[PDB]
Design a protein around this motif. Structure first.
Motif, PDB file in Angstrom:
ATOM      1  N   UNK A  56       0.810  -1.244  -0.030  1.00  0.00           N
ATOM      2  CA  UNK A  56      -0.152   0.095   0.059  1.00  0.00           C
ATOM      3  C   UNK A  56       0.818   1.239  -0.020  1.00  0.00           C
ATOM      4  N   UNK A  57       1.356   1.693  -1.263  1.00  0.00           N
ATOM      5  CA  UNK A  57       2.167   2.676  -1.341  1.00  0.00           C
ATOM      6  C   UNK A  57       1.878   4.198  -0.776  1.00  0.00           C
ATOM      7  N   UNK A  58       0.657   4.341  -0.836  1.00  0.00           N
ATOM      8  CA  UNK A  58       0.285   5.957  -0.384  1.00  0.00           C
ATOM      9  C   UNK A  58       0.673   5.968   1.303  1.00  0.00           C
ATOM     10  N   UNK A  59       0.337   4.767   1.981  1.00  0.00           N
ATOM     11  CA  UNK A  59       0.486   4.947   3.345  1.00  0.00           C
ATOM     12  C   UNK A  59       2.116   5.228   3.668  1.00  0.00           C
TER      13      UNK A  59
ATOM     14  N   UNK B 208      -6.185   2.506  -1.708  1.00  0.00           N
ATOM     15  CA  UNK B 208      -5.340   3.635  -1.507  1.00  0.00           C
ATOM     16  C   UNK B 208      -6.229   4.642  -1.906  1.00  0.00           C
TER      17      UNK B 208
ATOM     18  N   UNK C  18      -6.012   7.593  -7.130  1.00  0.00           N
ATOM     19  CA  UNK C  18      -7.001   6.628  -6.937  1.00  0.00           C
ATOM     20  C   UNK C  18      -6.673   5.342  -7.493  1.00  0.00           C
ATOM     21  N   UNK C  19      -6.334   4.372  -6.600  1.00  0.00           N
ATOM     22  CA  UNK C  19      -5.512   3.074  -6.990  1.00  0.00           C
ATOM     23  C   UNK C  19      -6.393   2.284  -6.242  1.00  0.00           C
ATOM     24  N   UNK C  20      -6.803   1.209  -6.913  1.00  0.00           N
ATOM     25  CA  UNK C  20      -7.501   0.085  -6.578  1.00  0.00           C
ATOM     26  C   UNK C  20      -7.001  -1.298  -6.841  1.00  0.00           C
TER      27      UNK C  20
ATOM     28  N   UNK D  79      -6.401  -0.835   5.445  1.00  0.00           N
ATOM     29  CA  UNK D  79      -5.135  -0.191   5.447  1.00  0.00           C
ATOM     30  C   UNK D  79      -5.359   1.450   5.282  1.00  0.00           C
ATOM     31  N   UNK D  80      -4.211   2.028   5.705  1.00  0.00           N
ATOM     32  CA  UNK D  80      -3.869   3.541   5.976  1.00  0.00           C
ATOM     33  C   UNK D  80      -4.350   3.831   4.484  1.00  0.00           C
ATOM     34  N   UNK D  81      -4.707   5.397   4.485  1.00  0.00           N
ATOM     35  CA  UNK D  81      -4.870   5.955   2.986  1.00  0.00           C
ATOM     36  C   UNK D  81      -5.827   5.408   2.359  1.00  0.00           C
ATOM     37  N   UNK D  82      -7.316   4.787   2.903  1.00  0.00           N
ATOM     38  CA  UNK D  82      -8.162   4.369   1.928  1.00  0.00           C
ATOM     39  C   UNK D  82      -9.565   4.446   2.775  1.00  0.00           C
ATOM     40  N   UNK D  83     -10.449   4.546   2.121  1.00  0.00           N
ATOM     41  CA  UNK D  83     -11.810   4.849   2.492  1.00  0.00           C
ATOM     42  C   UNK D  83     -12.141   3.800   3.389  1.00  0.00           C
TER      43      UNK D  83
ATOM     44  N   UNK E  12      -5.584   2.550 -11.653  1.00  0.00           N
ATOM     45  CA  UNK E  12      -5.339   3.843 -11.048  1.00  0.00           C
ATOM     46  C   UNK E  12      -5.826   4.945 -11.903  1.00  0.00           C
TER      47      UNK E  12
END
Lengths: 161, 218, 787, 302, 93, 371
Positions: B165-168, E11, E54-56, C349-353, E65
């Motif tokens: 999870x790169x954004x974190x 993310x 916006x990355x799924x 996880x962090x950074x996620x809705x 993304x």
């Protein structure tokens, strides 16, 4: 099998890598402004690790109820406030007489006494103390200004501040 | 089991109990002399030595409670610096003292709460009475604590770049580059930010962080 | 008046400083009698002196201080109902305690406050007196006499007005009871206002969810039997012509989820009103919106009624909120185990809705891990920002691991060494190291283990093992059933779903028989495998190397990890030898559990358990007897001995072994156990089917504080073992082991303790059935060696 | 006129003494000590030996696995740490004619008042029982079995001087109580089944020991020089049975015995969990005097 | 080697299509923040750009993304938006 | 363990047996247990040589007051119902007038029976449960329920003529404030130590007035065990209090004539010139009407659960929770006789008429007695 701490003395905190500041190149600033984890610079100046005295600062015990038995720095206090200021002098001279303490000069027409040094023993740590106490009892009125000034503090014969 | 005696007798014997390393009888006599003389002309002295006992006997929560009530009911003093230093060292001893470290367990990941509180405390001290006698030890411990918190945040950043999870990752290293921009952790971290900008295909930002790695690379 | 000294003679509480601050007779001016009364009244308002007798001495005042310090103690005379802590906090609530100065003018009212507290607990008749006692030169204490009459008793929970439902029904569904069954003692007839309010709520709910939407309580009355003994409780109601539901009208701002909302607002046209279904539909809307991200919406129902036709319609309001709530998820209180250990099991996880259900999957998994006693979720919001949240799990640890040892003894030397440690989260790193072993006069043994359950980050969990087991068995010299066996393992296993898992991996098990006793079963096996020994000769040497292919499955779904209260558990577990190995068998165990809760507070829970098994040969050969299923003993079939159920070996006769002293080693030589005859060994057959069942009830004595860590239970077992190759034709006069229909039951109690040695256990049992030669054991535990 | 019935009834007395004066125990030899313990519970393992030296010539073996918590309720008198205890005996013995074994269990509560300086004034209310399984080879008669009970007293009386960190001086005093059985049988060698029917024994066994414990120290391992001495008597050694030799009736009963035991034990407390300790006893003065008996103990607090 | 299980990865900065079609040039920080949320990946090192990414990651189904970078101005007004559908280069497998 | 955990106050058992005369029991009919142990007011009354008693949960018998013959025994609890006969829980107090015997219920109903057979003349419903002996006067039939709702009732039709309202604190005594009548003016107790009143024609609350300290928010002890029933004199009105701190007053005024807040009396009587009553704690005491001046007391029966007293042949009678019956002199002031009849204890007010004396115990339910 969780938690069995033991902190009777530990020496892993003199070796952490000193803070090497983070340089930055041309254009890219960084906003440390939320810096609260900021160690302000302050000169010295004392001991580290086991060279310190965690042993609490001196504060003596009252012999009489109503005695401000306070100690700060290197001076004590036994200030008492009784009915008349003509009671403490005979008691203290009786103490100094019958308890066999030595004093070089005492102007018995006054109340200002300069003594010789006195030694005390204390197995709390592994060191001992010796010093010269000077009580200056001057009757400001129905009170009694008591002050103690230590001139030299010798540790088993060696004067140390 | 209190022996009802004159007070200074109790103090003499309690002091000797401190002497012998006889902390248990020590705290016993002290606790008695203190609570049963709730306005003794020396309650300050017995309180201070009581805290010293608590700590040196290694049972901390009572020590913290005593320090706190001492602060509350005596909000000024000629000897407050000792109180603050002792609160701080109480925390930092709560931090990591499981002697299981004999196996060499780097304890930088278990929660950084106690270290955080200890840092707040020691910092309040060193910014209160800088020219006291309890300063240089405080500064050394502050350096150590900052490094420890930084290493915790780096541990979490590393785990996230493992998972994906790169954004974190970019946010946690934004942290360790906003609050600790001195230590060794952040200099070991920056490549993580480089990587986790590359994966998201945000190249220009990767080139920026590349410049920054280069300029402090030695 | 010129006062030169203000006599504070013998205060023992206050100094001269607080005195002068609270001084009316301050020095400097001309004092008068008004100021004298002011001084007396100030000392009174402070209340430190039994009799403030101020006397003027020429020009100075002196108060004849009488000793009312100190309150030397707080003595209590047999409360028998309330912990003295509550009494002391209720006393300081009134205003006096140790170290203070006495207040003679309040003792009666303090005692009355005690009376009030007793009225609060349902015990009305009560009287309490105060007594003073002299002690050296300041101390005078106050003891509290006590007389505690009896807890009153609810005689009759009446109900008036109800014409629809019977009274006893409502009485039963209450939380209070006026008639408790002796043979089914549940609760006691004692009354408490909190229970009364709760009961009113329960009754109101009970009428609400029936159609009677207009029902309401009208009053309430609780009389006191004029004997300080009994309670009468009456409740007045108005049922009011139940209505029917007409149609939902959900309306507002949905943020594009109309469809599934409609599918959660389905009401058969003509359905009776149902309050609980209204609140459930409302909560389901809340949760649905709480999945896609909107975690903090506000939703109000409003049953707009229509008394004309007496049918009802539901308006509903909904609101959006915002989304990206998670920004930093940090843990607390995990002071021993690593942080990566916890974040490996976070499906949010962090950074996620923010997905509320995702965070809850987290909480669940953290529980089902086992390392933790309690896990408490949370959701704070970050100030200054509108829509960001910092999930935080408060986690308190527990002592995993163990140290299982014990000696026990037997034959004539004083030697036994069973030891072993199973650390299971060794130093937090998530591993599970387990090493146990034992020595003896004859048998050595050692077993290692390690199983990193996150050898990658997906879940692939690599394991290991190793075991050395020499049954040297030097009875006199040699030739005495030597059994040398060692080998290793590797068990790599990934997950398949949110609960399941598979396994794989090879194992190699050397073995060496030597000089066993020519029984029947072992010899059926041997003779079946080409090697045929002399029927009456102790000497024979059978050594075999093989390999395998382990494989498995599981299904872990519980509510906790150590003392469960709901879910299931399974794990098939197989084996098979690959070609090239020196024997061809295959076996498949199948553990199982189950739990089903009885209460809704999760104290009472019925258990469930079973095990199964099999084995065979892959063409002619047979499952090598050294791996049959033993069964019986603690943790498998309670009550019996360990490994003592199932067939009993037989023996051929014997003449010479070069080890047979006079009346030594009675192992079927000439002296004892001649041609075919049944001894009392336990050789163990292949098949196995051990059921069980328990009944879990709360501990009877320990307060909850750590009664969380003990669980008492009654239970019921069974068990069996047979030998699906046990011929019966030529061996008629012997019990037909091939017959499974030989259940051996039991029953008893059990207690467990999670003491720092790890899980202890104690269990008294009774073999409600037996067969030929089954040694019972009515007491078992694992702090050492059994009964 | 059975002049070997003398030796035979002597063997019966021997099995009586075997059972009971094999099943005796101080708080010493059974938990070593409980002065200055911390934790919740343990596993009081134990082992012994103990060949006899009476008129027959016998042997011994034991095992005594245990468990029990002890909550710290300082209530009455001198420091009282009440505790729980269960035990499991798997005694094993022999003789100059026959052999036998036994399984056994009971409750073992105690206290730790002991003047808080060493008295053994406690509450050792041990409740033990047996069911002895014994073979018999005097003509192969073989079997006769029973149950039995042994109710304990516990506390001993020691006034400690403790002038230094080494002197553990204290006397001991104990007295136990029980009964065995009405073992009824007949030894058949001369056609008419010669019978022996021992109604019961119900003895009362007393001792008046004295302890001279000598302490010691390591960094954190406490050792000791455990020596002791004292009487050991009985009060009611009735043991009167029948003599159905087919020649008539005859009553011969036992008498009170007297022996002074010698003890040279020790103790260890390495690493405050374990309390390993290996002790040794000896006896004198003629009757069932034990000669070679070691006694190894153990404990593992939590 | 063949693989079987992995959970899903998310993310931040969920994005519909209409909302993206709302924010135009000339707006102010507060307005965009109100119309989409708070950009949980800012750019510290310099200029005042926000990063909406916006990355799924759907559990062995490649990767999707929609990168979106808003660059503000000195005072806070908006001057340019850079929108981008599914990332360039192959996402993998 | 369970037995050794109670501690209460005690009671002197049975002092000074004096038995001057011969206590007799005419008949011991068994109308049926009965009041059990639930507190209530079932006081079987008597008119024209006919006794009409009742149980708690069931029937209503008509007894021949010369020997105890059952004239008829109806069972009002419904034959049909939900669980079993639906125990009617009769807790009112049997009464007599015309040809009816009003019997207050606990299901908030007020039966009305008939002397001859038992044909229910009518049957009403009233807000809250009745708990007071219904009173007859000028057609009206008052009843003071347990909601503080004096819902008057018309006679031949069970018609609800009005409903006055009263207050209700939290912990009331078992609120049993019977009403009375005087000069077409209704006096009535209350549940807050407030002797109210009402004009017995319309419902005009003539005046409220607080008498003394009733249990609650100024709580007297939990044993304030009293009946608030007042009584009338030639022109002056007496009354206890909801604890019993006696008071006196006049019809129109209520201005207290005096006060005796020392004896929290329970279930009282008067006659002519001197009071007679039972104390809060069983201290039977005389008193002079004009002012609360004691005459003589007695304290034999402390903490023995008593019943209200009765005048009879120049003697005073009392019951007890132990089945005895302690005759007492009208002057000073000590015992006169003693007896015991039943072993289940009395709990209800006895009666007195035609020389006959009656009382119902929890089980024997009748013991006609003559000395």
């Amino acid at each position: 099998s969780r938690y069995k701490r033991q902190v009777s003395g530990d020496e892993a905190y003199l070796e952490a890598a000193p803070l090497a500041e983070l340089h930055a190149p041309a254009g890219m600033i960084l906003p440390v402004t939320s810096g609260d984890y900021a160690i302000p610079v302050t000169n010295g100046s004392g001991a580290v690790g086991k060279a310190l005295d965690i042993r609490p600062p001196a504060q003596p015990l009252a012999l009489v109820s109503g005695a401000r038995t306070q100690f700060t720095g290197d001076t004590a206090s036994l200030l008492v406030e009784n009915g008349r200021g003509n009671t403490l002098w005979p008691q203290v001279v009786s103490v100094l007489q019958a308890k066999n303490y030595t004093i070089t000069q005492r102007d018995d027409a006054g109340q200002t006494l300069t003594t010789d040094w006195v030694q005390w023993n204390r197995l709390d740590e592994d060191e001992q103390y010796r010093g010269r106490y000077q009580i200056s009892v001057k009757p400001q009125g129905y009170q009694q200004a008591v002050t103690v000034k230590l001139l030299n503090l010798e540790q088993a014969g060696k004067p140390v501040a | 089991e209190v022996p009802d005696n004159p007070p200074n007798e109790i103090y003499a014997t309690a002091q000797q109990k401190l002497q012998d390393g006889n902390w248990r009888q020590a705290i016993t006599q002290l606790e008695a002399l203190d609570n049963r003389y709730p306005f003794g002309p020396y309650s300050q002295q017995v309180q201070l030595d009581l805290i010293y006992a608590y700590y040196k006997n290694a049972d901390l929560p009572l020590a913290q409670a005593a320090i706190d009530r001492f602060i509350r009911l005596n909000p000024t003093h000629p000897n407050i610096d000792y109180v603050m230093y002792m609160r701080g060292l109480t925390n930092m001893a709560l931090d990591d003292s499981a002697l299981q470290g004999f196996f060499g367990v780097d304890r930088s990941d278990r929660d950084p709460q106690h270290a955080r509180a200890a840092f707040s405390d020691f910092s309040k001290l060193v910014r209160g009475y800088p020219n006291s006698q309890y300063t240089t030890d405080a500064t050394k411990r502050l350096v150590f604590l900052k490094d420890r918190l930084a290493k915790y945040e780096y541990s979490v950043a590393e785990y996230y770049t493992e998972r994906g999870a790169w954004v974190a990752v970019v946010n946690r290293v934004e942290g360790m580059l906003r609050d600790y921009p001195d230590t060794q952790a952040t200099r070991d971290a920056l490549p993580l930010m480089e990587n986790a900008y590359r994966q998201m295909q945000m190249n220009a930002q990767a080139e920026k962080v590349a410049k920054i790695i280069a300029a402090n690379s030695s | 008046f010129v006062v030169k000294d203000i006599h504070f003679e013998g205060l023992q509480r206050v100094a001269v400083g607080a005195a002068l601050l609270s001084m009316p007779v301050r020095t400097g001016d001309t004092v008068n009698d008004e100021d004298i009364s002011n001084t007396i009244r100030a000392l009174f308002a402070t209340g430190n002196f039994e009799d403030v007798r101020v006397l003027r001495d020429g020009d100075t005042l002196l108060v004849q201080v009488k000793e009312r310090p100190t309150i030397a103690s707080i003595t209590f005379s047999g409360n028998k109902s309330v912990k003295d802590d509550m009494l002391k906090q209720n006393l300081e609530a009134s205003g006096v305690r140790v170290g203070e100065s006495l207040d003679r003018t309040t003792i009666a009212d303090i005692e009355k406050g005690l009376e009030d507290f007793y009225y609060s607990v349902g015990k009305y008749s009560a009287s309490v007196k105060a007594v003073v006692t002299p002690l050296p030169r300041n101390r005078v204490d106050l003891k509290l006499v006590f007389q505690e009459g009896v807890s009153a008793e609810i005689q009759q929970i009446n109900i008036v007005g109800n014409h629809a439902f019977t009274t006893d029904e409502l009485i039963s569904h209450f939380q209070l009871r006026d008639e408790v069954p002796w043979w089914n003692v549940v609760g006691d007839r004692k009354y408490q206002k909190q229970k009364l309010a709760g009961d009113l709520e329960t009754l109101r709910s009970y009428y609400l969810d029936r159609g009677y939407a207009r029902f309401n309580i009208d009053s309430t009355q609780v009389s006191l039997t004029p004997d300080k003994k009994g309670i009468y409780v009456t409740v007045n109601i108005t049922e009011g012509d139940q209505y029917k539901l007409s149609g939902v009208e959900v309306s507002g701002n949905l943020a594009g989820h109309s469809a599934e909302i409609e599918q959660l607002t389905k009401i058969e046209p003509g359905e009776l009103y149902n309050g609980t279904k209204v609140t459930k539909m409302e909560d389901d809307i809340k949760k649905l919106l709480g999945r896609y991200g909107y975690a903090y919406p506000r939703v109000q129902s409003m049953p707009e009624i229509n008394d004309a036709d007496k049918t009802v319609k539901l308006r509903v309001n909904v609101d959006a909120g915002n989304r990206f709530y998670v920004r930093k998820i940090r843990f607390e209180g995990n002071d021993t185990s690593k942080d990566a250990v916890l974040r490996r099991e976070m499906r949010q996880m962090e950074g996620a809705w923010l997905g509320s259900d995702l965070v809850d999957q987290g909480k669940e998994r953290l529980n089902r891990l086992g390392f933790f006693e309690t896990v408490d979720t949370d959701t704070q919001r970050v100030p200054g920002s509108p829509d960001q949240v910092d999930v935080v799990y408060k986690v308190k640890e527990r002592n995993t691991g163990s140290f299982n040892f014990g000696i026990g003894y037997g034959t004539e030397s004083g030697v036994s060494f069973q030891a072993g440690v199973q650390q299971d989260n060794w130093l937090g790193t998530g591993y599970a190291v387990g090493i146990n072993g034992t020595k003896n006069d004859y048998q050595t043994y050692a077993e290692l283990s390690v199983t990193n359950p996150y050898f990658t980050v997906d879940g692939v969990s690599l394991g290991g093992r190793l075991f050395y087991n020499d049954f040297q068995a030097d009875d006199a010299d040699l030739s005495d059933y030597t059994n040398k066996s060692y080998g290793t393992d590797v068990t790599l296993g990934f997950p398949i779903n949110e609960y399941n898992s598979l396994r794989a991996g090879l194992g190699y098990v050397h073995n060496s028989l030597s000089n066993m006793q020519p029984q029947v079963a072992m010899w059926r096996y041997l003779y079946s495998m080409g090697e045929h020994p002399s029927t009456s000769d102790q000497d024979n040497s059978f050594k075999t190397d093989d390999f395998t292919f382990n494989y498995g499955w599981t299904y872990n779904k519980l509510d906790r990890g150590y003392f469960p209260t709901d879910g299931s558990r399974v794990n098939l577990t197989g084996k098979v030898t690959i070609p090239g190995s020196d024997n061809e068998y295959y076996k498949v165990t199948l553990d199982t559990a189950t739990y089903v809760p009885i209460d809704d507070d999760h104290k009472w829970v019925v258990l469930g358990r079973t095990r199964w098994g099999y084995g065979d040969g892959l063409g002619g050969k047979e499952m090598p007897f050294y791996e049959n299923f033993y069964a019986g003993g603690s943790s498998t079939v309670r009550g019996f001995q360990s490994n003592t159920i199932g067939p009993k070996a037989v023996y051929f006769p014997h003449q010479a072994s070069n080890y047979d002293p006079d009346y030594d080693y009675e192992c079927a030589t000439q002296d004892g156990a001649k041609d075919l005859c049944k001894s009392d060994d336990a050789v163990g057959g292949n098949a196995m089917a051990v059921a069980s069942l328990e009944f879990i009830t709360p501990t009877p004595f320990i307060s909850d504080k750590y009664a969380n860590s003990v669980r008492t239970s009654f239970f019921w077992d069974m068990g069996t073992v047979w030998d699906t190759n046990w011929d019966s034709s030529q061996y008629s006069g012997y019990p037909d082991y091939s017959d499974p229909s030989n259940i051996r039951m039991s029953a008893g109690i059990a207690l467990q303790w999670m003491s720092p040695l790890g899980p202890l256990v104690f269990s008294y049992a009774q073999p409600f059935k037996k067969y030929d030669g089954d040694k019972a054991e009515q007491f078992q535990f694992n702090c050492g060696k059994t009964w | 006129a059975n002049k070997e019935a003398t030796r035979n009834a002597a063997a019966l007395f021997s099995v009586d003494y075997k059972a009971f004066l094999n099943e005796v125990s101080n708080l010493n030899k059974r938990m070593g000590d409980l002065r200055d313990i911390n934790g919740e519970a343990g596993c009081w393992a134990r082992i012994m030996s103990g060949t006899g030296s009476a008129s027959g010539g016998f042997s011994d073996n034991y095992t005594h696995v245990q468990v029990g918590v002890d909550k710290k309720h300082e209530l009455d008198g001198l420091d009282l740490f009440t505790g729980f205890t269960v035990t499991h005996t798997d005694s094993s013995a022999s003789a100059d004619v026959f052999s036998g074994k036994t399984k056994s269990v009971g409750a073992g509560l105690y206290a730790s008042a002991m003047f808080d300086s060493g008295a053994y004034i406690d509450l050792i209310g041990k409740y033990v029982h047996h069911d002895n399984e014994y073979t018999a080879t005097f003509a192969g008669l073989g079997t006769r079995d029973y149950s039995t009970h042994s109710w304990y007293a516990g506390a001993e009386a020691g006034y400690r001087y403790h002038v230094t960190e080494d002197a553990w001086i204290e006397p001991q005093a104990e007295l136990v109580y029980g009964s065995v059985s009405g073992k009824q049988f007949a030894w058949k060698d001369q056609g008419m089944h010669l019978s022996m029917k021992d109604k019961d024994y119900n003895p009362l066994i007393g001792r008046t020991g004295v302890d001279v414990g000598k302490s010691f120290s390591g960094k954190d391992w406490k050792v000791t020089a455990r020596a002791g001495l004292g009487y050991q008597f009985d009060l009611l050694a009735n043991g009167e049975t029948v003599l159905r030799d087919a020649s008539g009736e005859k009553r011969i009963k036992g008498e009170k015995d007297s022996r002074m035991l010698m003890s040279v034990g020790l103790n260890a407390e390495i690493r405050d969990n374990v309390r390993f300790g290996l002790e040794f006893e000896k006896s004198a003065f003629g009757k069932y005097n034990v000669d070679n008996a070691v006694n190894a103990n153990f404990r593992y607090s939590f | 080697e063949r693989v079987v299980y992995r959970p899903d990865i998310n993310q931040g900065n969920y994005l519909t299509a209409n909302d993206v079609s709302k924010i135009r040039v000339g707006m102010t920080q507060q307005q965009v923040a109100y119309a989409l949320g708070t950009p949980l990946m800012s750019d510290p090192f310099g200029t005042n750009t926000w990063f909406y990414v916006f990355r799924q990651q759907p559990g062995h189904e490649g990767v999707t993304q929609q990168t979106l970078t808003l660059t503000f101005n000195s005072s806070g007004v908006l001057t340019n938006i850079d929108n981008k559908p599914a990332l360039s280069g192959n996402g993998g497998h | 363990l369970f037995n050794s955990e109670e501690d209460v106050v005690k009671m002197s058992p049975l002092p000074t047996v004096e038995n001057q005369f011969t206590p007799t029991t005419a008949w011991s009919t068994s109308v049926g247990s009965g009041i059990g142990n639930f507190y209530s007011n079932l006081h079987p009354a008597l008119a024209d040589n006919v006794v009409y008693a009742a149980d708690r949960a069931g029937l209503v018998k008509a007894l021949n007051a010369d020997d105890g013959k059952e004239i008829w025994s109806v069972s009002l609890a419904e034959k049909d119902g939900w669980f079993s006969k639906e125990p009617a829980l009769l807790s009112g107090g049997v009464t007599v007038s015309g040809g009816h015997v009003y019997i207050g219920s606990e299901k908030a109903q007020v039966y009305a029976l008939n002397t001859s057979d038992g044909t229910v003349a009518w049957q009403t419903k009233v807000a809250g449960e009745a708990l007071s002996r219904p009173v007859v006067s000028d057609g009206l039939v008052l009843i003071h329920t347990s909601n503080g709702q004096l819902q008057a009732l018309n006679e031949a039709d069970g018609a609800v003529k009005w409903t006055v309202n009263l207050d209700m604190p939290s912990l009331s005594l078992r609120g049993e404030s019977a009403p009375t009548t005087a000069f077409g003016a209704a006096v009535v107790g209350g549940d807050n130590g407030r002797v109210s009143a009402v004009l017995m024609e319309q419902g005009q609350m003539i005046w409220q007035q607080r008498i003394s300290q009733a249990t609650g928010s100024t709580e007297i002890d939990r044993l304030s065990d009293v009946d608030t029933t007042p009584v009338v004199v030639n022109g002056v009105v007496f009354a206890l209090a909801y604890n019993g701190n006696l008071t006196a007053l006049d019809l129109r005024s209520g201005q207290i004539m005096w006060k005796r807040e020392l004896g929290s009396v329970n279930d009282f009587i008067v006659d002519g010139n001197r009071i007679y009553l039972v104390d809060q704690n069983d201290r039977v005491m005389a008193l002079t009407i004009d002012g609360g001046v004691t005459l003589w007391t007695q304290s034999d029966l402390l903490h023995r659960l008593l019943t209200s007293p009765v005048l009879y042949n120049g003697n005073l009678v009392v019951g007890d929770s132990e089945g005895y019956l302690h005759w007492i002199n009208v002057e000073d002031g000590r015992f006169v006789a003693q007896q015991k009849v039943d072993s289940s204890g009395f709990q209800t007010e006895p009666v007195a008429a035609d020389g006959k004396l009656l009382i119902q115990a929890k089980d024997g339910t009748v013991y006609s007695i003559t000395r």
